[PDB]
Known about the structure:
By secondary structure, chain A is mainly β.
Amino acid sequence: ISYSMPEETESGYLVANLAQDLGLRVGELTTRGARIHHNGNKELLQLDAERGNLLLKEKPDREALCGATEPCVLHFQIILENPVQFFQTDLQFTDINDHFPEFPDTEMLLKIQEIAQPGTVFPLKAAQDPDIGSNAVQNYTVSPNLHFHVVTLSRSDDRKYPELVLDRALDREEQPELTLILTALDGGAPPKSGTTTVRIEVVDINDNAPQFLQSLYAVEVPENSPLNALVVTVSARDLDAGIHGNVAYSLFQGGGGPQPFVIDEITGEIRLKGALDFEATSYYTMEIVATDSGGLSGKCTVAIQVLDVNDNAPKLTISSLTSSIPENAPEAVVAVFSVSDPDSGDNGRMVCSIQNGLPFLLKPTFKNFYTLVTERPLDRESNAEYNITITVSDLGTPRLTTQHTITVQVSDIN
Amino acid sequence: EAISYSMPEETESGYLVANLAQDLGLRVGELTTRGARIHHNGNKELLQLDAERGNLLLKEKPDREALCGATEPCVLHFQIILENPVQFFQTDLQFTDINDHFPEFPDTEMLLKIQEIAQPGTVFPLKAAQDPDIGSNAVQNYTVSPNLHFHVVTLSRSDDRKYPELVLDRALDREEQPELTLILTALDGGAPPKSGTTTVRIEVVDINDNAPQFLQSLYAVEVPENSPLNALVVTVSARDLDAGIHGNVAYSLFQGGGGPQPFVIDEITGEIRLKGALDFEATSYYTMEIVATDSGGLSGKCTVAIQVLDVNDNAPKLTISSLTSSIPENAPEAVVAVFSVSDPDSGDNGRMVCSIQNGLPFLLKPTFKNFYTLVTERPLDRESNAEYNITITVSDLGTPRLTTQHTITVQVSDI
Ligand SMILES: *[C@@H]1O[C@H](CO[C@@H]2O[C@@H](C)[C@@H](O)[C@@H](O)[C@@H]2O)[C@@H](O[C@@H]2O[C@H](CO)[C@@H](O[C@@H]3O[C@H](CO[C@H]4O[C@H](CO)[C@@H](O[C@@H]5O[C@H](CO)[C@@H](O)[C@H](O)[C@H]5NC(C)=O)[C@H](O)[C@@H]4O)[C@@H](O)[C@H](O[C@H]4O[C@H](CO)[C@@H](O[C@@H]5O[C@H](CO)[C@@H](O[C@@H]6O[C@H](CO)[C@H](O)[C@H](O)[C@H]6O)[C@H](O)[C@H]5NC(C)=O)[C@H](O)[C@@H]4O)[C@@H]3O)[C@H](O)[C@H]2NC(C)=O)[C@H](O)[C@H]1NC(C)=O
Ligand SMILES: *[C@@H]1O[C@H](CO[C@@H]2O[C@@H](C)[C@@H](O)[C@@H](O)[C@@H]2O)[C@@H](O)[C@H](O)[C@H]1NC(C)=O
Ligand SMILES: *[C@@H]1O[C@H](CO[C@@H]2O[C@@H](C)[C@@H](O)[C@@H](O)[C@@H]2O)[C@@H](O)[C@H](O)[C@H]1NC(C)=O
Ligand SMILES: *[C@@H]1O[C@H](CO)[C@@H](O)[C@H](O)[C@H]1NC(C)=O
Ligand SMILES: *[C@H]1O[C@H](CO)[C@@H](O)[C@H](O)[C@@H]1O
Ligand SMILES: *[C@H]1O[C@H](CO)[C@@H](O)[C@H](O)[C@@H]1O
Ligand SMILES: *[C@H]1O[C@H](CO)[C@@H](O)[C@H](O)[C@@H]1O
Ligand SMILES: *[C@H]1O[C@H](CO)[C@@H](O)[C@H](O)[C@@H]1O
Ligand SMILES: *[C@H]1O[C@H](CO)[C@@H](O)[C@H](O)[C@@H]1O
Ligand SMILES: *[C@H]1O[C@H](CO)[C@@H](O)[C@H](O)[C@@H]1O
Ligand SMILES: [Ca+2]
Ligand SMILES: [Ca+2]
Ligand SMILES: [Ca+2]
Ligand SMILES: [Ca+2]
Ligand SMILES: [Ca+2]
Ligand SMILES: [Ca+2]
Ligand SMILES: [Ca+2]
Ligand SMILES: [Ca+2]
Ligand SMILES: [Ca+2]
Ligand SMILES: [Ca+2]
Ligand SMILES: [Ca+2]
Ligand SMILES: [Ca+2]
Ligand SMILES: [Ca+2]
Ligand SMILES: [Ca+2]
Ligand SMILES: [Ca+2]
Ligand SMILES: [Ca+2]
Ligand SMILES: [Ca+2]
Ligand SMILES: [Ca+2]
């Protein structure tokens, strides 16, 4: 004979009316010297022989008695002596939902990279439940968010294990860290729950390119500026963090000609490497390029205009027509000369002068092109030779003067 | 107006610039009669005057880049003077640039570090080639050595200067081709064109685009019940196609939703060790899942099934319930006692047999499964023996064999 009864029933519960089930008289139970025999460690059942009833001595717990084995049936044998008779009886215990779903870890750590595409699965630790069947784990739900959703798998021996599925791509630049609530629901009535915290750490991915604060840099620097002069400092910013955010500055020269400028890849400072000359090159158009450790780059145009400095003296060049000059020759051209100046503005503008005492005349024929002509015929006895010191001088600040001497002799017939 | 003569660069000295006498409309004798002379700003005479044949010649070879450079046009303003009578003429000499310079790149080798997940259409700035020439004689085109992942584009800017930029058309893969080498060539527009090559070495940056994979899809291992605590069961290894911090793997143990399991995993080596005690009579079969995870989130999973082995570590449990301490003399078929045997083990380790002495006139009769009875085989007088000893000996059929015995003394009555 076999009897069935729910788990965790209070001790002293009336199991079965043994007297009626055996079809024997009430006094016969104590008459035959009814005893109970079993190899169990604990005597779960005590026999009331006077009323012929089978009673529980202690409160049973299925998980501690059977555990994983199902059905939980305990076999024992009751013996009678008058006459000698044996009766094997089995007792089955129906499992109840008296266990709450418990997660292994109080928090689960997930480090998901930013470029993780939707549909990507992530394994989660399952909630365990010592119960059996519908009283065990049945459902898994995740706290309402816009990124993930959990799905339950009944793989293998019908043991349910949850895994998290991504639906919308992550972004560390928007939300660095996620915190979800993983809830496990039982299939019993009423259902039992078990909650844990899913900690999602979004790993940074270099998906952002560095950009300069200014698209154009325009700075003026004098020609006579000292070596290692701070021309301009350039700054670029990256939206990413760590090594993925570090930038490296590189100088791209424009067209031909050497660039006397150097950039620091770290600080972003542009400084003088060589010499500057407004007369050689007055305007530089270059491009600074900041690049991360990934290859993503940003570019900016830097324009540097050199300032003019009066550091050039006028170049006086003279070609003589007549080494000697007749006495009674009116209006004679002694020599013709031209002046030069690479500078600009008043630094390039130049006025030339001659001694006022000399009977000669400077006649400006062409632009920066003068002629030295005698103003009147000359006698020999007065002055044999003449030292004419032409002095060309610019109108800049400071003023630079260049002068040259020519000797002209007046001569009649030999 | 003033007169101007044009002449290509790098012309050999002694070149016939122009018939100056005819251009000025003067007689052949008149030019040398008036003492025609040449005046220019430079000390170095670039021009020399031939008053005999009335021609203008070159005294030095002109270099446009050394005279003008970037300025255009390269015009030298010079003057011609006459002395019979005194007269002044303005004349200009323009030097047409010639394609006499090779395009050169500043650096012999340019290093690029491009990500593996770089999307097509991504631009990568490259340093331009230098050319002191002007117009069509400067840098005009940019071509890149035949590859599969890149193509160069020639862009113009500001003063219509040409600069190259590299364009990706096919995504890279460090697991396929870690490093790439290109030849960047710059082509002139002159005739014939002139090239300028340089190394462009592209180093593919690693991106975590590989998930860890287990060598085996299933792991099976037998472990004895008597095995010690914290003993290495099996070592699992997973490989990652990536490298560096994107390649190192961390192992995690995932158990079933049934009950607690006595096992632990090493994150580095991948060794599974025992955590608690093992008993075949408790839990016989274990199914766990090992999950390998990198530093990016990409994972791989393998199923590890371990069944424990049964050992004969449980002696049979004998429990005897006696009915009669004393027995009648001439009583046939008398039931002395009734006992039960147990064995939690399985197979021959659980199978058990019971024995009694051969000299005793008692018979051991089986009534129920693993449940026997001690009954007299035949009546017997007292004068032979007053009391008898019955040592029930129960033993399993395992290896080694475990035995357990217990004695019961029974007396006869009625004299
Ligand atoms: C069926 O099996 C039975 C069970 O056997 C058991 O299983 C086997 C495998 C063995 O493990 C065995 O040990 C188990 O018991 C058998 O029953 C038992 O049988 C044994 C032996 O047959 C009885 O003796 C017991 O064992 C000791 C024997 O010692 C042996 O070794 C030594 C040294 O090798 C050797 O000693 C030498 O003996 C000779 C001869 O005397 C001497 O000349 C030598 O000098 C001496 N050597 C030296 C160095 O000195 C022996 O020859 C053996 O080989 C024995 O010592 C031991 O004695 C103690 O333990 C018992 C415990 O029961 C005590 O008995 C109780 O004492 C109480 C106190 O006086 C007494 O109370 C009195 O009660 C009465 C009324 O009842 C009155 O009221 C008084 O006022 C009270 O004081 C109790 O009544 C008494 N118990 C009984 C039942 O009467 C004893 O005093 C002492 O403390 C021990 O006796 C053994 O007794 C016996 N078991 C029982 C319960 O009786 C049975 O024999 C088998 N069947 C057959 C047919 O054989
Ligand atoms: C598992 O649970 C899913 C989510 O149900 C939600 O949670 C419960 C506690 C209620 O608040 C309910 O209003 C929510 O929608 C269900 O969509 C799904 O069907 C369930 N699966 C099974 C097998 O029951
Ligand atoms: C005219 O100049 C002649 C040349 O002298 C030169 O110029 C002067 C300024 C010094 O620098 C001298 O060392 C040069 O050799 C003179 O010999 C002559 O006396 C000068 N005539 C007059 C009237 O001063
Ligand atoms: C440069 O060369 C390529 C290949 O020969 C050609 O397709 C392209 O039209 C050229 N560009 C110019 C501006 O000539
Ligand atoms: C299980 O338990 C949780 C709270 O722990 C409830 O929110 C849920 O609805 C279910 O009752
Ligand atoms: C599981 O999650 C619930 C969410 O309601 C918490 O209230 C609880 O403390 C446990 O963390
Ligand atoms: C994660 O967060 C939940 C609430 O969101 C806690 O209840 C839990 O203990 C863990 O700290
Ligand atoms: C560019 O092309 C010319 C031929 O047009 C080669 O001679 C030169 O070496 C470079 O490859
Ligand atoms: C540029 O590259 C070409 C081909 O590698 C060489 O031949 C040339 O000398 C220059 O270095
Ligand atoms: C880049 O190109 C140069 C030719 O200038 C080679 O020498 C070098 O090995 C790389 O291919
Ligand atoms: Ca329970
Ligand atoms: Ca439950
Ligand atoms: Ca339960
Ligand atoms: Ca982003
Ligand atoms: Ca990012
Ligand atoms: Ca970046
Ligand atoms: Ca200067
Ligand atoms: Ca200057
Ligand atoms: Ca000046
Ligand atoms: Ca040249
Ligand atoms: Ca060229
Ligand atoms: Ca040239
Ligand atoms: Ca790849
Ligand atoms: Ca990779
Ligand atoms: Ca990886
Ligand atoms: Ca065992
Ligand atoms: Ca065993
Ligand atoms: Ca055994």
